[model samples]
Target: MQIFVKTLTGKTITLEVEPSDTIENVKAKIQDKEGIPPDQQRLIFCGKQLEDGRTLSDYNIQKESTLHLVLRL
Candidate 1:
């Protein structure tokens, strides 16, 4: 599935992740792409934190969904 991800800095990115991909996976991708550390990263969706180890389905995310990520500075 393809997800639209936007960073706190307003940078937008696209990711192709599997249905089984956990929030941690997305975190890793963001870290890799934006060079932010996991400890310093904060991902929020629908005004809630996207906790690690939870799959996209846990958040009721669908394919081609757009999720906004905020990096806590």
Candidate 2:
């Protein structure tokens, strides 16, 4: 499945993911693609914050869903 990651500057990136993929996995991909550090990346899905240990399936994220990425201090 694929999801849209919207960055702070309004840039969106398409990420291919699976249900079993964790939030950390998503952050790693973002880090690889955009050079953002995993620890500094905060993912928000459906108004809830995504935790590092939580899988996509845990949040019931669906295909084409948009996850907002915020940079943390």
Candidate 3:
């Protein structure tokens, strides 16, 4: 499945991830793309914080779903 991720800086990226991909995996990908650390990242889905260790399936994410993320320096 493909997910749309938006960073705090207003940059957006599309990631092709599987159903087994955890929130942590998304974080790592965001960090890699945006050059931000995972520890300093905050991912919000539907206005809720996406906790670690949870897969996209856990949150019922869909292919058209867009997740918002913020990076605090």
Candidate 4:
């Protein structure tokens, strides 16, 4: 699935990942592409905070799904 990660600043990144992939995996990809580390990435999907251990499927993420990405304060 392709996840569209959108930031508060209107930036975006498309990550190609599996539905079973963990949020930590996405965070790693975000770090590589956006320079934001896992710890600093506050990911929100469907109004829920995405936990590192949770899989995309766990959050009901589907193809072309969009998620909010903000740097932790």
Candidate 5:
């Protein structure tokens, strides 16, 4: 499945993911494409912060889901 990430600048990043993918895995992809480190990326879904160790499926993420990405200070 694929997911969309909305960056702070309102840029939409499209990523290919799997249900078994961990949050950390997703951040790595973002880093690969955007040059943002995993520690600097915070993902939010449904008004909740996504944990690094948690799988996308654990959060009930579906195909085409859009997540908010906030850069850490």
Candidate 6:
């Protein structure tokens, strides 16, 4: 499954992940690719926060879904 991540700075990155993968897993990947750590990261999809341990499917994320990412202060 592929999703679009839009950073707070308006930078967008495309990620190919498993539907079964947890949001935490995606955060780790974002950290690796975009240098944002999981601990300092927040993800939102469809105006709802994407909590750790929850699968992408759990969030009802469809292909090409746009997700928002914010860095913790």
Please estimate how well model 3 matches the true structure, expressed as its whole-model Cα lDDT: 0.85
The order of the candidates by TM-score, greatest first, is 5, 4, 2, 6, 3, 1
lDDT by residue for model 2 (1-73), tens: 9989998898999999998999999999899889998998889998999999989999999899899998987
Candidate 1 ranges beyond 4 A from true positions: none
TM-scores for the candidates: 0.84, 0.94, 0.87, 0.95, 0.97, 0.93
Per-residue accuracy of model 4 over 1-73 as CA lDDT, tens digit each: 7889998778879999999999999999898898887898999998999989999999999999999998878
Error of 5 at 50 (Å): 0.5
lDDT, model 6: 0.89
- By lDDT rank, best first, the candidates go 5, 2, 4, 6, 3, 1
Candidate 1 backbone clash number: 0
CA lDDT, candidate 4, residue 36: 80
Error in Å for residue 37 of model 6: 1.0
Top candidate by lDDT: 5
Per-residue lDDT, model 2, residue 11, is 98
Q: Roughly what TM-score does model 3 have, to 2 decimal places?
A: 0.87
Q: Could you tell which candidate, 4 or 6, scores higher by lDDT?
A: 4
TM-score, model 1 to reference: 0.84
Most TM-score-accurate candidate: 5
Comparing 1 with 2 on TM-score, the higher-scoring candidate is 2
